[PDB]
Amino acid sequence: RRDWENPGVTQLNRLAAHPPFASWRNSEEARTDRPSQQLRSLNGEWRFAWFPAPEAVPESWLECDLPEADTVVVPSNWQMHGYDAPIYTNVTYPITVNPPFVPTENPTGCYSLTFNVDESWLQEGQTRIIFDGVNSAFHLWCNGRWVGYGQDSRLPSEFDLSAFLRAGENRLAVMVLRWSDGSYLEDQDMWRMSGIFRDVSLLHKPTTQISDFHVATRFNDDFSRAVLEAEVQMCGELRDYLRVTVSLWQGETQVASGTAPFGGEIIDERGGYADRVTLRLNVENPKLWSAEIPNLYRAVVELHTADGTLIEAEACDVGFREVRIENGLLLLNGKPLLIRGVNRHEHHPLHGQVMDEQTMVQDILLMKQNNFNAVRCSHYPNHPLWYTLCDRYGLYVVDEANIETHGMVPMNRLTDDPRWLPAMSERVTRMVQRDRNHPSVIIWSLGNESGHGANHDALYRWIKSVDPSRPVQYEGGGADTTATDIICPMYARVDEDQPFPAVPKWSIKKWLSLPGETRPLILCQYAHAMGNSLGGFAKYWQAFRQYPRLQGGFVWDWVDQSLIKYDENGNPWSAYGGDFGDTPNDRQFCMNGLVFADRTPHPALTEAKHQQQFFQFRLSGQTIEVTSEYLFRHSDNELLHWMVALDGKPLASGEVPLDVAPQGKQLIELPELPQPESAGQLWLTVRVVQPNATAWSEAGHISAWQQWRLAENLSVTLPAASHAIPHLTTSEMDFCIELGNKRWQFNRQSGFLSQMWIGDKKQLLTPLRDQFTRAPLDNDIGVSEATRIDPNAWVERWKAAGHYQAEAALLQCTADTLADAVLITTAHAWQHQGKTLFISRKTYRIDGSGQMAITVDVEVASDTPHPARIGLNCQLAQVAERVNWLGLGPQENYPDRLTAACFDRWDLPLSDMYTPYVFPSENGLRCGTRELNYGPHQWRGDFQFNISRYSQQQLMETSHRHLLHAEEGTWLNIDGFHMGIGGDDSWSPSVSAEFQLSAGRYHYQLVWCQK
Amino acid sequence: AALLQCTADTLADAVLITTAHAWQHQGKTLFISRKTYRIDGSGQMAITVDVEVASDTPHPARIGLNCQLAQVAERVNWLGLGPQENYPDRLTAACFDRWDLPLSDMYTPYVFPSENGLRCGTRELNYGPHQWRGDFQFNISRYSQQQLMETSHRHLLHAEEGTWLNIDGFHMGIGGDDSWSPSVSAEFQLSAGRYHYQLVWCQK
Ligand SMILES: OC[C@H]1O[C@@H](OC[C@H]2O[C@@H](O)[C@H](O)[C@@H](O)[C@@H]2O)[C@H](O)[C@@H](O)[C@H]1O
């Protein structure tokens, strides 16, 4: 029948979907969510064999274990066990586009399990098996007999095994196809794997049973009264003595309870549902649920007889909240949300797409700790536990159907085709049936990147009918079609329009006000955090706070989808597209997260944390005004710590309790500060600290900070006049300068400082030279590739202009003696194919104090692409342990991504000065630096720098961090100016004009001395 | 202007004068200006200026130099934005080219006198025997900034001896979104803290 090549068959013999059940036979267990003996896990060791096509599977396997099989753990993705390769492709399908057919060589995983069933489960009642996730389609047999078939890799498939099992040992056989017609709907930008990758369980339910239950909470105008409504459905034989009791608990207190026999109200001319009942419970002053305070109640649904015998109980966590869009705003509990969201795929560097509770918790804790309050399930329903964690920890969730057909041409080819409406329908309806009681889900999404087709409009309306409690969004076809209640673009820019035909991406500020538009706008994906990125993040946050209808967005995305491989020595390394022989592949495009696959943060996470703070600050004099952006809570676990320091030297500090209502302000007056001793800049840093631990943070957690410059007393004192005067020696080849123990050598033929000595020790491995390029970031490269150059990408413009190849031509090199110093004057031209790209003119002035002051004035041809940087570089002979600086930090920061950094005195081990992006590039910059110390050297000025053991050349030539090797000595790059890194997207130039080095003429000055 | 330093060095083919000054008020240092003047065998005077402005002082209206020249010439010739008066936040209509007007056209006769007649983006300016080159903004007229500021009606201004030249490395925007609250946008305020500019002054 080849059911896997027919979108008209998405299942055979599958049971209806429904919310999470456990069939407790003890009501107190159901109240406290304790494990149920009626819900057994079949996870653990199973038998598995791999075949290249279903045609290759032997018939013997249905009744007997294959001796050749292996024992493996389930859940798992079989690529993670090495049976075949995972594939990383973004848009292009991994199989030929020829719906609904799939390749004849279709990797088939044959899983089986011998397991016991107790007679008690078989004497009465129903025993079903539940596969929470099987990718992408499968047939199931039990004790040799065929049971059924299922598709949709991201929702549970359940089958009644009652008539197939026997007491004692039984054997399941599951034939899992890698590719199926369901694959046409599963084109998300992620690794393509397969297998039984979510839990497998067995559930016993009584013959007369709760088959579904829906919980709703409705409120009066001020949220001081609610009615909880629970509709309960049964299967099995109706009897007058049956009853349903629904009770509501807040902790150990019972708040309300109601009982009724079955029999619903009249629905139409034929009557009502005799098999359902709706219980209505009044709740006065309910504790409301939000991500700020995830207050939860427990609803316990009991099916029992009138005389009091329990038949079974089901239950769920209930969060009293209302979600609605009114007057163009998305309101939660009547207040307008500001979504500090992130998209999160289910990805583990060792386990592939298998999720575990520890990693889920780790993700939620890091998210909350970093000021996120929302998560989008990009782009499919998640493992069930995720919703329970978001309900209890408090995160708003966008639950999204497993429908993505990005690779079709045009993108809506399937979604506008009615023959695909049935398969799409089940992806949406079965998700709502499973997840509609979770308070954390506040919005449903119809899928991702599948154009806009009439199937979407039919499904949008279905959801609006069945569950009016949550808005429906969908971005396909232009982000603002009739299938979305929220304008939800991906990567629309703040101020810049991108007027693509048919599906323009307007500036978000402009989009809100197009003629006739009134909806809220929340970007489904924004700020592409691939590599060294997040440049321009702050511009989004300023716009979200200024415009009521810009209600935030979901960053793209949480975690890099890198996978671990092992080298010949057994050591692990992070791999990306193409590293498994997979081809075609989209290389490093699978790594776009704020955190590395192991959950270590990239530096961009701190920028997101700062911009997403819940407290805003203003300073006027000695007065700090603190404004709360919380909607519901008062600042009852917060104090403000303030510190004033002079050039990094601490002068005074204090603490003040914060007591700010939601949306309110607090005025704090700082105490007078005695005028500082010395000259310099006074800086004020304030932090909000949480003194007590929470379920998601440790005592002492810092949730928000900001700095301001206070008074500055410019230095007007003349220095202690030199005890000596340096000596110049002129030679045909060099100009040398001597001062005590120091010596500087300037090469007359190159025009550069080629060597320095302290005592008898040489200080340089490569001369000090101008540098106008950077090892390109993922954002500089975009989609450009050797075989398919994108001439618009910054890297290609620089390359084509000759920036990477240009040679310094010496124009002048002279030496003069002054009363107290020696002055070397140079001028160089960088040219390419006859064109002068840049001119650098400098003076180096070495005085009796031993200081070398370097003044640099650069001219950049107006018609050459703006350069990546304007600075100097050198390879120092020394390798020292620490890096100490007065400037922005402590983490890597770039011009367009430096708001989270603070100006202070920082000191880190050298290796913290290198950011190990998987795909190596320029990294580790620190901006706004006035002093840098390393080994015996000190440089002073107003510059940006990086320092590490890897040269720019090595970073640009290396594609994987594991291949980098420390070079001799230490490469120092000191920039007067550095271009932004961009990040609105990683496929088109995204560095805003204000961060491009277009001024034409640049000046900077450095002083290099000893310390 | 308190003098912090004033030195002279003789070089290979030039004389180098270095100066440093601090402007203070009531004990507060507002601005520091560090300069070098390099006069060579060609007769050109290269001036380099590096100014520091206290972060806590209100951003200044301009960062430049001024002097009253003895010369009074009929024309003003420049390579830069024009021909009309233009300021940083009001120069889109001006075009870069070589302009040449009579001196009086370099003054705008606002009824209530004020700073006026600036031209920005100028790379070369000629007046009588003098030529200044660099990348600056300037105005030039027979009226001192002092006179303009003290005189409330244009008809009461009187031409001073000579010609007042204001050559700026940087000049604050003029604003205008309204005339009753500060309206110069941040990007046109001189808040960078450190400013660099260079000019060459020569004859003919
Ligand atoms: O992380 C990759 C990112 O790619 C986005 O698509 C990028 C760009 O690729 C082209 O092949 C498409 O035709 C073009 O329309 C698209 O914008 C995708 O939107 C994101 O979801 C993400 O996969």
Ligand SMILES: [Mg+2]
């Ligand atoms: Mg099928």
Ligand SMILES: [Mg+2]
């Ligand atoms: Mg028990």
Ligand SMILES: [Mg+2]
């Ligand atoms: Mg048996």
Ligand SMILES: [Mg+2]
């Ligand atoms: Mg896609």
Ligand SMILES: [Mg+2]
């Ligand atoms: Mg490729």
Ligand code: NA
């Ligand atoms: Na807003």
Ligand code: NA
């Ligand atoms: Na991607």
Ligand code: NA
């Ligand atoms: Na508090």
Ligand code: NA
């Ligand atoms: Na690289």
Ligand code: NA
């Ligand atoms: Na006046």
